Amino acid sequence: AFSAPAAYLTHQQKVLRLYKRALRHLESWCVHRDKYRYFACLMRARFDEHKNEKDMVKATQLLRQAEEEFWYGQHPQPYIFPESPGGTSYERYECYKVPEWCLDDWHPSEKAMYPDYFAKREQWKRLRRESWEREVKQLQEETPPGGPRTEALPPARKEGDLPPLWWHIVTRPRERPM
Amino acid sequence: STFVAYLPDYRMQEWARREAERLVKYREANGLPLMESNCFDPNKIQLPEDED
Amino acid sequence: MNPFASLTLTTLTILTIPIMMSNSNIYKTNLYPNYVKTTVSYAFTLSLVPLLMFMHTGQEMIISNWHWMTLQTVELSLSFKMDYFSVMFIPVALFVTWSIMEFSMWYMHSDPFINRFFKYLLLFLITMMILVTANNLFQLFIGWEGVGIMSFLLIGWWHGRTDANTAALQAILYNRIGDIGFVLSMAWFLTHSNAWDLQQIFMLNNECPNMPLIGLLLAAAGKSAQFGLHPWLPSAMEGPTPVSALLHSSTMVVAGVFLLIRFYPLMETNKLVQTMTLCLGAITTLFTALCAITQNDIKKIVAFSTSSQLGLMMVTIGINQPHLAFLHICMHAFFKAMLFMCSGSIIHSLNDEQDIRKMGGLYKAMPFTTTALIIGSLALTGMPYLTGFYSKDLIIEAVNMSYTNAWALLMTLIATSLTAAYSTRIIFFAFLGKPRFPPLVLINENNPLLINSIKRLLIGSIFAGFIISNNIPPMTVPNTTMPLYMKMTALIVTIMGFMLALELNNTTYYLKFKYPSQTYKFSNMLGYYPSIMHRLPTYHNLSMSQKSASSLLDLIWLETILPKTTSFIQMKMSIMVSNQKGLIKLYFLSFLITIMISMTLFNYHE
Amino acid sequence: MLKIIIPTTMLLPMTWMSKHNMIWINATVHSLLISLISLSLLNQLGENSLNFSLTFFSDSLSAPLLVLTTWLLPLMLMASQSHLSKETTTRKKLYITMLILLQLFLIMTFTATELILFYILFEATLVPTLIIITRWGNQTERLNAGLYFLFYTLAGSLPLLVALVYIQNTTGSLNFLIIHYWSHPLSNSWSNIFMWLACIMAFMVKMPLYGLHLWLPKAHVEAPIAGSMVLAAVLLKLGGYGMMRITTILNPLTNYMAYPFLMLSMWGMIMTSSICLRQTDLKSLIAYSSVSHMALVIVAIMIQTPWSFMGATALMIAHGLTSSMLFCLANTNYERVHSRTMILARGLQTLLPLMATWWLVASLTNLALPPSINLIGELFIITASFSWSNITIILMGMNMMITALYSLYMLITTQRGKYTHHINNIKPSFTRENALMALHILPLLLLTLNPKMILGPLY
Amino acid sequence: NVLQIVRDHWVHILVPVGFVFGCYLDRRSDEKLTAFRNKSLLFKRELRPNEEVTWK
Amino acid sequence: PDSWDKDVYPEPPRRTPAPAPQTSLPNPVTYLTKIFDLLVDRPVTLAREFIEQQHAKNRYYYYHREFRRVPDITECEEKDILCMFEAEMQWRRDYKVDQEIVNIIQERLKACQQREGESYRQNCAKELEQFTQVSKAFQDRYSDLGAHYSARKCLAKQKQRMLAERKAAKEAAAA
Amino acid sequence: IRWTYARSANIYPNFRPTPKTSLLGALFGIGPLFFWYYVFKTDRDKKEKLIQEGKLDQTFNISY
Numbered sequence A: 001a002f003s004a005p006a007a008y009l010t011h012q013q014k015v016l017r018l019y020k021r022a023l024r025h026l027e028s029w030c031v032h033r034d035k036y037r038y039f040a041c042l043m044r045a046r047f048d049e050h051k052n053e054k055d056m057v058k059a060t061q062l063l064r065q066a067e068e069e070f071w072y073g074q075h076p077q078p079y080i081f082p083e084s085p086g087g088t089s090y091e092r093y094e095c096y097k098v099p100e101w102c103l104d105d106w107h108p109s110e111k112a113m114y115p116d117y118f119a120k121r122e123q124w125k126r127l128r129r130e131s132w133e134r135e136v137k138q139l140q141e142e143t144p145p146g147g148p149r150t151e152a153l154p155p156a157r158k159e160g161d162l163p164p165l166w167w168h169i170v171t172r173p174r175e176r177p178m
Numbered sequence B: 001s002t003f004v005a006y007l008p009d010y011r012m013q014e015w016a017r018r019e020a021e022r023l024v025k026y027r028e029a030n031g032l033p034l035m036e037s038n039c040f041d042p043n044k045i046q047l048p049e050d051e052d
Numbered sequence C: 001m002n003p004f005a006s007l008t009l010t011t012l013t014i015l016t017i018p019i020m021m022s023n024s025n026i027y028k029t030n031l032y033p034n035y036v037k038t039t040v041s042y043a044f045t046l047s048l049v050p051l052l053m054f055m056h057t058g059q060e061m062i063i064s065n066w067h068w069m070t071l072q073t074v075e076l077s078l079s080f081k082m083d084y085f086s087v088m089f090i091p092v093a094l095f096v097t098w099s100i101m102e103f104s105m106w107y108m109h110s111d112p113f114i115n116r117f118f119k120y121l122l123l124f125l126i127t128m129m130i131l132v133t134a135n136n137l138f139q140l141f142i143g144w145e146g147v148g149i150m151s152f153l154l155i156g157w158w159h160g161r162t163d164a165n166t167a168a169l170q171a172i173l174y175n176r177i178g179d180i181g182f183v184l185s186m187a188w189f190l191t192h193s194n195a196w197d198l199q200q201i202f203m204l205n206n207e208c209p210n211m212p213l214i215g216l217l218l219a220a221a222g223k224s225a226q227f228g229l230h231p232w233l234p235s236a237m238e239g240p241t242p243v244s245a246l247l248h249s250s251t252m253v254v255a256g257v258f259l260l261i262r263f264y265p266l267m268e269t270n271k272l273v274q275t276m277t278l279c280l281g282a283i284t285t286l287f288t289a290l291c292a293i294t295q296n297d298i299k300k301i302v303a304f305s306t307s308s309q310l311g312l313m314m315v316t317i318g319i320n321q322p323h324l325a326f327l328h329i330c331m332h333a334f335f336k337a338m339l340f341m342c343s344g345s346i347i348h349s350l351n352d353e354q355d356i357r358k359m360g361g362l363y364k365a366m367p368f369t370t371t372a373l374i375i376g377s378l379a380l381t382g383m384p385y386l387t388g389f390y391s392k393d394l395i396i397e398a399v400n401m402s403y404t405n406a407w408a409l410l411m412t413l414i415a416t417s418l419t420a421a422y423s424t425r426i427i428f429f430a431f432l433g434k435p436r437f438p439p440l441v442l443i444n445e446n447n448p449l450l451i452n453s454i455k456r457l458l459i460g461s462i463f464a465g466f467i468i469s470n471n472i473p474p475m476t477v478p479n480t481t482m483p484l485y486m487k488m489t490a491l492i493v494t495i496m497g498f499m500l501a502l503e504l505n506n507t508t509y510y511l512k513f514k515y516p517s518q519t520y521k522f523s524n525m526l527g528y529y530p531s532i533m534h535r536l537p538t539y540h541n542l543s544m545s546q547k548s549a550s551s552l553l554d555l556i557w558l559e560t561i562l563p564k565t566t567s568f569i570q571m572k573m574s575i576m577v578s579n580q581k582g583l584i585k586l587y588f589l590s591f592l593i594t595i596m597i598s599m600t601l602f603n604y605h606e
Numbered sequence D: 001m002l003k004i005i006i007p008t009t010m011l012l013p014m015t016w017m018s019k020h021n022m023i024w025i026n027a028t029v030h031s032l033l034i035s036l037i038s039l040s041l042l043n044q045l046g047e048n049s050l051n052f053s054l055t056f057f058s059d060s061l062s063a064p065l066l067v068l069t070t071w072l073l074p075l076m077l078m079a080s081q082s083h084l085s086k087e088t089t090t091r092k093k094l095y096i097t098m099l100i101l102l103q104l105f106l107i108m109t110f111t112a113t114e115l116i117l118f119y120i121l122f123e124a125t126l127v128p129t130l131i132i133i134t135r136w137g138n139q140t141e142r143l144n145a146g147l148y149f150l151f152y153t154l155a156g157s158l159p160l161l162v163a164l165v166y167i168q169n170t171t172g173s174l175n176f177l178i179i180h181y182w183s184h185p186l187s188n189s190w191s192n193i194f195m196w197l198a199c200i201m202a203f204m205v206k207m208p209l210y211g212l213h214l215w216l217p218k219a220h221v222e223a224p225i226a227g228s229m230v231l232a233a234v235l236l237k238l239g240g241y242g243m244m245r246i247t248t249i250l251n252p253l254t255n256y257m258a259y260p261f262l263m264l265s266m267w268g269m270i271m272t273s274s275i276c277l278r279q280t281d282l283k284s285l286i287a288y289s290s291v292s293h294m295a296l297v298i299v300a301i302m303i304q305t306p307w308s309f310m311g312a313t314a315l316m317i318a319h320g321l322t323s324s325m326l327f328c329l330a331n332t333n334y335e336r337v338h339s340r341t342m343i344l345a346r347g348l349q350t351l352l353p354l355m356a357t358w359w360l361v362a363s364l365t366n367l368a369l370p371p372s373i374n375l376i377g378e379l380f381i382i383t384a385s386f387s388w389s390n391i392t393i394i395l396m397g398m399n400m401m402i403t404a405l406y407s408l409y410m411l412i413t414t415q416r417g418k419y420t421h422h423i424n425n426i427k428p429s430f431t432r433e434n435a436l437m438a439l440h441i442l443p444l445l446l447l448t449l450n451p452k453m454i455l456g457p458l459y
Numbered sequence E: 001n002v003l004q005i006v007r008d009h010w011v012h013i014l015v016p017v018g019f020v021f022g023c024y025l026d027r028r029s030d031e032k033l034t035a036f037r038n039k040s041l042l043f044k045r046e047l048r049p050n051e052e053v054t055w056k
Numbered sequence F: 001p002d003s004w005d006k007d008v009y010p011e012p013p014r015r016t017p018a019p020a021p022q023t024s025l026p027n028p029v030t031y032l033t034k035i036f037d038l039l040v041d042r043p044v045t046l047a048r049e050f051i052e053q054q055h056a057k058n059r060y061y062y063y064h065r066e067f068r069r070v071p072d073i074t075e076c077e078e079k080d081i082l083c084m085f086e087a088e089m090q091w092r093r094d095y096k097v098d099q100e101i102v103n104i105i106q107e108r109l110k111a112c113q114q115r116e117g118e119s120y121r122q123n124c125a126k127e128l129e130q131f132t133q134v135s136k137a138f139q140d141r142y143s144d145l146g147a148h149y150s151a152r153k154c155l156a157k158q159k160q161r162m163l164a165e166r167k168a169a170k171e172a173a174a175a
Numbered sequence G: 001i002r003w004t005y006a007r008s009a010n011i012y013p014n015f016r017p018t019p020k021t022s023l024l025g026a027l028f029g030i031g032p033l034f035f036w037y038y039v040f041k042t043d044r045d046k047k048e049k050l051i052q053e054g055k056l057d058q059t060f061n062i063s064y
């Protein structure tokens, strides 16, 4: 979810995605491990059968029939990892994620506790404040006049700079905030 | 809320209950029907001349 | 005064004490869950006494303590019924809830809001007690909606997750559908019997008509998740495992069957409503087990199992055996709750993994959980002389010797087989074979809370059926003369289901792969009922709410008729009236015409 | 009755002679004291009303309305002082004067013995509300909405006057006691039909009845918080009070003429409840729920049974309190994000837990959770309608199903989910707002223990 | 020092006295509707040997 | 107890069976009853007797209000407001009393149904008959008046019923 | 803002009375009212006719 998407998926990416999806659904069908290994080797051989096809029209047609066969033969209840978009713990811990700016609204009595943490937070805030203009200038100078063609962002190029648009990426709450 | 809770019974609910007990006792002891079908005495009602 | 009324009232009273302490300096300390668990255990111990009194002398009472109000000739007062059903279900519910809180003290140890979770469970228990002990229909409705709202709040415990909120709202909708029938029955009873309590309703209805009983049946179908309104129960598994074990497995979901049991004197007189109840129970107990036999989520399998058991209870009600239905409720609570705790223990030990395809050999890795689930599956399938034998087998034999719809009997037998089928599925795919979980082994069950909580309900699921069955007076006429083939039919079908399920499960070991058939697709996708009924009616309603109700009517035509037409007419009239060039030659001619008109039309007609 | 009217009048020179920084404190304290004094009117009789004098009287129907009207003013002052901080002293005093005048007019309206005085005050209530909406509203639509508030009511209320002065020319009096005691049946004629229409539609517009309800989603949305509060809590109940009062002279024609209005109301429940399901505006959702709830009271009054009247009174009081609380809760979010779009700010339970609890309680009370007085009124109306006709249970229950749907949805959209990332100005809830919700909700739960106080003269 | 309190807190007695005044104005009204005092058929009674009016 | 009247709230003589044991095992119910009596009942009755001694030191009384009989609506003239008002108030009081009578009968029926257990259908025929008679009378009097009811409407209903009965009697006498 | 404005404030200015719009509005705003009126009138006339001839079993119907 970190990599910027492309305008389109090439043929190689489509075939790789189909291979991974078919292997996952085959594992869903073949519960036992040895049976899954056997049929995964069979599927890998089936994929390697046309590994060096140079006719792009034929390759596209083959991929289309493979997609049709997968859609017919897909598992109605495929295995999903618990934290995956379909899993049983996908967005379980979002209620515990609190943005850091809320810490700015704490009462001074609350900030009396954790003094070192708030000193380090003040240091982080000063560091963020001192480097915003340089990041904006870098984005302005690197971006083509028409506009950004993709969502990819450039890294820091000088010595005392930080990568542009870094605050919210670095200051993510947590994966297990509580 | 305390003032509203302890408001005197000006709706006369307990009074109505007590009158009900007295009347139930009287009609059950005398054997009269517990409740009459006519609330007004028919002797004081002057109906029209005839049914036709 | 006899101690019966005082103890029965105090049992419910002391459950509310930890709620009043939710604003004290015990709610902000990590000792609150233990405090609530101790309170529940003490409440169970106190409730054990009226049960003993009833087993001694069969003593029953009603306590109308607080007079709420009086609408003319109708009096509403806070009244509690302490008959056999209340004094028997209260200790069972308290025991199950105590075990569930003890389990939750270990399951939800890392939750930042564990105190709120425990107080929510206690509030649900209070609402359930209010539901059970209610003597009038208004108090029963209070408890009904209380348990509904508590279920809504506990299903969406993780409110940052979209699916939990969706499941909670779905449960609310499906329960409101039956709340419609509940309100219908209440209105009919108020209008015709001039009462909402049970005594006058029973007195004034020697032959109850169709409508109130149909409303009660609709409410029961909504609460117990019968075939018409089933899908909310399987989806209520989004919440924490203790919520599923306590609310949606053994205690809250039996509310509809309990409501039908409470009105059994009226149901004895209407044959049509009994037939409808029997048919609904049969179709539910068939369909839910048919969906269960192919599920991969263990919690889903247990949810479909409990829905099938509820369907069996409704079938039992349909054949005029209410006491058998109540006895089956009491028996089912124990082993269903402990099966859910075993499932939760497995899930916790496998790093929050619920798919049975990634659970391998836990027979030796988790010996105590394994033995507990084996005992529970045996009790659920009706193994003789276990807890479930004393209710389920008698239910089957009662259906076999009644003037019954033949299809209902056949579907009940097939569901009895499918119960053993899915029990075999669970055992085979969760405890037999080789491990299929991630190699970093985190299996650990050596926690005293978990062990004691499971062990108490294990002792229950072993001995409670025999203990209860031998201490209640006979409430029916026994079936002492049966043919041998029909005396063993439940055992025969359970055994046969065991064998076919085991054979088809061992079939999966072969190195053969083939695409699924249409029957498996129908069974696995829940008969395509959620895939259709949650998409077509919802889409049509939400599209009509905006296309016509909001845009076409409110924003266009209602504006067009009264206000916009008035504005247009007034503007046109103003433009016509005020458009004069100011030349005297025109309106003096107008004056001449007016003078002539006044001289002719008015002056000539005096 | 003057022991309540005169202090309300004295609130004006008090406000105008107060310090520049002391108007709110004194106004709130003395309005709360006036509410405490007005609590004494709840001591009603079981046979006849409290006839203070030839001009003012109090029955069991108008006592809870008086108590609610007097109780709302301190809440309006508490809710208004936040967004009027930068306002000048003179305009603050003018706003407080408008609120006091509205309260005084409502107090006199709910206690007038004669119908012409009741109409005069019931129409005089329009001016302060219109001034508030059109002067202290925030958007440019506030002018147009004001017109919608002004001409919808008058077009319905002007014929009513023509009816009232007609009745006094035939019966000789417009006193309510004489009208009740000397009541005569209405013949079935076109003249009597139009007299029935004239005496009724003025109160149908203020309910508002479905079809004539377009002014409400405008006026409630574009008004300030206090304007919307007084519109939902009290001003909607004027139509119900007047209709319950005036239905005495309409029998037996009410049996025949109520069918179109009954059909409109029973279908408008479903229409407005469905409209609430698709509403991008939170304040508009609350406004439409208000109409959905008032259609029930319309049906209850139209069917003319004691149970229906008790249910209508209880539902009116409960809806007033609930709608006021919901409008306050929405205004709290608006004062943070400065937008009424419901999906703009999400996951507010994580950031404002106690306000989320207030939201949950308000939503639960809105959908008539037992044993709240909302549920009591709704159930009484349902039973009365079922006695009127069994088939009605098909519609009412359906409405109930929708009522729980758009309520919890409203709770889910704003409180649950995940917080929107770009918003970072959500400050912790102030003590003033929390106290406002507490004072909105605590009497609501307290009235459960003593329902007979809000069940009207038919109890 | 009494002025320092009175001159800025007299507005706090407008509503209190406006209450009591109202009460007085109620009682006078009751004096204009005494045409049936101790004359209704339901509450007509023989006066106590010392009292003068059944109610004020 | 003497708090209420036993003629208005009757109940059967309360036949109970004497304990006749058969096994030698101890009875837990008896032990728990003794514990409840020693631990709960005695402190409660001690506190109540203290409260009663405190109450006896201050004895004051309250009275049931007696209402005279005023002429009904039948004796009032067409537009004579005072007697009309008095008769309407008396009618409202009688209506409330009738409501409470129906309430008492309903309470009797409820107590019957709960007390008789499984024989309630047979042992409570008298209560059902009394409730049926009282309900029929109340329905004849006050039903269908609706909101805005009055003594005049009830009198009109009674007059219409009397006309119907007279017509039915005349029709029957012609056979 | 564009979405909310289009859904709320931009609808009437872009509305034109057409046969489709008129027919849909008439149906969805008029048909249900008369349908429910007919249903309720039929039921109530049946009930009143039953009451007039005195066969409804209105016993214990004290509250209404």
Ligand SMILES: CCCCCCCCCCCCCCCCCC(=O)OC[C@H](COP(=O)([O-])OCC(O)COP(=O)([O-])OC[C@@H](COC(=O)CCCCCCCCCCCCCCCCC)OC(=O)CCCCCCCCCCCCCCCCC)OC(=O)CCCCCCCCCCCCCCCCC
Binding pocket: C293, C294, C410, C413, C414, C417, C418, C421, C425, C492, C493, C496, C497, C500, C501, C504, C505, C508, C515, C516, C517, C518, C519, C520, C521, C523, C524
């Ligand atoms: C005591 C005297 C009585 C003796 C009776 C005689 C002896 C027994 C009779 C035998 C009866 C069936 C027994 C075999 C079980 C079936 C298992 C199987 O492999 O089936 C293969 C196949 C599914 O296998 P698969 O897809 O290859 O497996 C994928 C992988 O294995 C995926 O792997 P997996 O891990 O996911 O596992 C999937 C799952 C299996 O996946 C499935 O879901 C398929 C199994 C379906 C079970 C259905 C059984 C009962 C159904 C009742 C339905 C009522 C009517 C409904 C019809 C509606 C019509 C629209 O496997 C299991 O978990 C175990 C299966 C259950 C075994 C235990 C069953 C015992 C109860 C049934 C027998 C009754 C005994 C007691 C009766 C007592 C009465 C006196 O299903 C079938 O082809 C046959 C299904 C049987 C009924 C379907 C009828 C045909 C449907 C269309 C008919 C034409 C309609 C035209 C239109 C009409 C419109 C009006």
Ligand SMILES: CCCCCCCCCCCCCCCCC[C@@H](O)O[C@H](CO[C@H](O)CCCCCCCCCCCCCCC)COP(=O)(O)OCC[N+](C)(C)C
Binding pocket: B001, B002, B004, B005, B006, C019, C020, C021, C022, C023, D039, D064, D065, D067, D068, D071, D317, D443, D446, D447, D449, D450, D454
């Ligand atoms: C934050 C932490 C929360 C949890 C901890 C809470 C601790 C426990 C506190 C909760 C108590 C539980 C309540 C249980 C019920 C007991 C109270 C009950 O007994 O009192 C009622 C009494 O309550 C009152 O009737 C209701 C109060 C009136 C409410 C009015 C609100 C105040 C006015 C505000 C204006 C708002 C506008 C209102 C518009 C109408 C009973 O009514 P009644 O049967 O008679 O009494 C019989 C005896 N009498 C007659 C001699 C008095």
Ligand SMILES: CCCCCCCCCCCCCCCCC[C@@H](O)O[C@H](CO[C@H](O)CCCCCCCCCCCCCCC)COP(=O)(O)OCC[N+](C)(C)C
Binding pocket: D188, D189, D190, D193, D210, D211, D212, D257, D260, D261, D264
């Ligand atoms: C969007 C919501 C706005 C508010 C809607 C208010 C609804 C107002 C409708 C009024 C209801 C009843 C009014 C008159 C009663 C009956 C009407 C008529 O349909 O009944 C027949 C009337 O017969 C004919 O239909 C005459 C009426 C025909 C002409 C009227 C035009 C109706 C078209 C609909 C206009 C839309 C109304 C709203 C305007 C904006 C009965 O036949 P008949 O036994 O002989 O007459 C009995 C009445 N008597 C005793 C007085 C003589």
Ligand SMILES: CCCCCCCC/C=C\CCCCCCCC(=O)O[C@H](COC(=O)CCCCCCC/C=C/CCCCCCCC)COP(=O)(O)OCCN
Binding pocket: D152, D155, D156, D157, D159, D162, D163, D166, D191, D192, D194, D195, D197, D198, D201, D205, D212
């Ligand atoms: C926001 C929109 C609200 C609409 C409000 C307007 C609807 C009001 C209904 C019409 C009011 C007119 C009635 C006036 C008062 C009636 C008093 C009365 O009884 O007089 C009648 C006379 O009744 C009339 O003359 C009224 C006729 C109507 C004249 C004005 C027409 C206005 C439109 C009428 C039809 C529309 C009604 C519904 C409007 C729908 C709005 C959506 C009898 O008098 P007599 O001459 O003595 O007869 C007995 C001796 N032979």
